[PDB]
Amino acid sequence: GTDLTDFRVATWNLQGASATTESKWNINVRQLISGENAVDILAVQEAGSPPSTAVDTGRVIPSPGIPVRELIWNLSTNSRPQQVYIYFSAVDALGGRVNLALVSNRRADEVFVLSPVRQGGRPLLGIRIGNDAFFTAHAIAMRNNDAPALVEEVYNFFRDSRDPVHQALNWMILGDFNREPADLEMNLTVPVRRASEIISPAAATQTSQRTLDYAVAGNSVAFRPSPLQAGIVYGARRTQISSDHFPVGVSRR
């Protein structure tokens, strides 16, 4: 119990494309995951292609026909955070504008790959570190979209586990839900509402003043609210990155 507060996590839709993401990874993602205020886990949407120097470990990951690879990314041989692990899903083997990733400063103990909940939707990619699981999500930009069903899929996945320790993992879904926080909350079933909390920043997370990028923390057997808060990473700076979404960080209030 009392888990998620040990981690600084974040989510960023970097609006990347497979052919041109080198700077967004080698500069912008690198800055989020290293240095004095590094996040431990970063969820990425529209991830493009991973850094050219990150190398597949060959880890065998069970998956229901969804591409997923573990890569090691060596960042330095001095700077405290020396290497990180990337879990990358090429969603399209074609244009590549809706790929997903998780970056972590610890190897994943377990990797989760859950199927899309709607035709044309993205899968859910998650990792477990100890008693906590973290997912990256990218709901469809449409009216009345798949965000509630994505959250419901994660809640049911853990509830249905045969192992009681897996049923009680603390989970967090970080992503671009493509609807505002209250709009997601009101469209969840009663048991999922009572078993989770939405953690969202007070500010807009994209340039159109909408709050679309945030986190849902939950536990499928015994939920207790966590003292977590979300904020805009770099909210105090005027940034010139080629994404219309801002990174959103989550950690203890």
Swiss-Prot record:
Any one GO molecular function term:
endonuclease activity
- According to the UniProt entry, where does the motif Nuclear localization signal sit in this chain? 179-194
Q: What is the effect of changing H245A?
A: Loss of DNase activity, no cellular distension, no G2/M cell cycle arrest
- Does the record bear Cell wall biogenesis/degradation in its keywords? no
**Key words, A-Z:** Endonuclease, Hydrolase, Nuclease, Secreted, Signal, Toxin, Virulence
Q: Does the keyword Signal apply?
A: yes
GO cellular component labels: extracellular region
Its Enzyme Commission number? 3.1.-.-
Top enzyme class: hydrolase
Output the superkingdom of the source species.
Bacteria
Q: How does it assemble?
A: Heterotrimer of 3 subunits, CdtA, CdtB and CdtC.
Main function: Part of the tripartite complex that is required for the CDT activity. CdtB exhibits a DNA-nicking endonuclease activity, and very probably causes DNA damage in intoxicated cells. This damage induces G2/M cell cycle arrest, chromatin fragmentation, cell distention and nucleus enlargement.
| The protein, known as | Cytolethal distending toxin subunit B
Q: Origin organism of this chain?
A: Escherichia coli
Read off the lineage from the record: Bacteria, Pseudomonadati, Pseudomonadota, Gammaproteobacteria, Enterobacterales
Gene name in the database record: cdtB
